[model samples]
Target: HHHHHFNLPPGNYKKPKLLYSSNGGHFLRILPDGTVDGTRDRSDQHIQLQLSAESVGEVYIKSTETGQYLCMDTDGLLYGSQTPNEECLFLERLEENHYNTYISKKHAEKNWFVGLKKNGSAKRGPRTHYGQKAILFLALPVS
Candidate 1:
């Protein structure tokens, strides 16, 4: 069947990948206890994200380590959950220099952004505006 032509199904996206932050100088990682943070290293599976394109410009970020999805709670907290919901859906926007910023689809009106704190902990809060380099990250292939 080497010469046989095959037709593939539509919407077959690529596998999960690592998101490297320019400001933090680390990779976005989800701890075993569902703690989302940035790590200076990429030796763990927590840094891998099951990036699924939900629509034209939206995506679902899932943790390959904990088998959970990155989500925001009602009170504006970041967590890795076992299911996908409105809070788990993010609108990925390409910014300057090809870095990406993920805005919560459910909290877009409030301008909730995903970022890392100075301590390397995952920070999800309302930013004065989007495109903050601290909140933005570049998706890179696993090394």
Candidate 2:
């Protein structure tokens, strides 16, 4: 499960990779393909949703590996209106490089970033990064 904050480039321009598992006990990878590939041991695994950042609030998420589960968000998940430094996206671990929840404490606020999740599950936790300015927020989310 990889948590991507998308505030900057990868620096190497190499495609980054993240691995995660659904509660259903299957290992998954989220990359440029952005699809959830289940372990071979599992037959006809259900769709494992994934996401990639396009802009603040604007993101790309898919329900399947093929061209079908495409979810394009012209509106940034976060509005990108934070005061300078605020947490825009948050990530929780599902495993190494695998994550279950990506959240933003400032989502409900006036920030260009509104936070997003690809999987259908809702993130359950108290909002962090509240009142934080953008610079600080930017520094954390991407790298």
Candidate 3:
């Protein structure tokens, strides 16, 4: 079903994490058959996938500074999906400051936020631990 948007004032929310890292940095490879392969390649020791844009080229950029958060605002329907044997988020980082903006904005009309709130900074160390914050705030399920 097609949905309609009202173009309300942009929703402003911030997601901050205290020095977070990813298990592995996945790579997207195009096969001869035109099929795309997204598999974990190497664990990016510092940065993690915050949000990803659906378009061919886009990213949600953020800094590793303390209290430095990323702001992702968009108008669209948030499609929620689930995957077996993996976490409930399909987020990808394309280039820079352009990611497949998580669809959680659609839930705003329902007064629903993505997840919880947490703190993030460079001091979190190589193995920092952020809580179950707003995954949708800057990420999505890999459906």
| Top model number, TM-score | 1
Better of 1 and 3 by lDDT: 1
lDDT for position 127 in model 1: 41
lDDT of 2 at 76: 31
Least lDDT summed over 10 consecutive residues: which range in candidate 3? 120-129
Question: If the candidates were sorted by their lDDT against the true structure, best first, what order would they fall in?
Answer: 1, 2, 3
| lDDT of all predictions | 0.74, 0.29, 0.25
Q: Itemize residue pairs with steric clashes in candidate 1.
A: none
Expressed as tens digits, the lDDT of each residue in 76-143 for candidate 1 is 77888887888899777666645677777787777777787656777757542565667868787774
Which candidate number maximizes lDDT? 1
Models 1 onward score TM values of 0.84, 0.26, 0.20
**After superposition, candidate 2 runs with Cα above 4 Å error:** 1-19, 22-41, 56-58, 65-101, 105-123, 127-143
Cα RMSD for predicted model 2: 12.1
Which rank order by TM-score, best down to worst? 1, 2, 3
> How much lDDT does candidate 3 score?
0.25
Each candidate structure's count of clashing pairs: 0, 35, 25
Query: Candidate 3's residue-wise lDDT over 40-101, tens digit each?
Result: 33332223222323332222323222212233223221212221112122223221232222
Off by over 4 Å in 3: 1-47, 55-103, 115-143
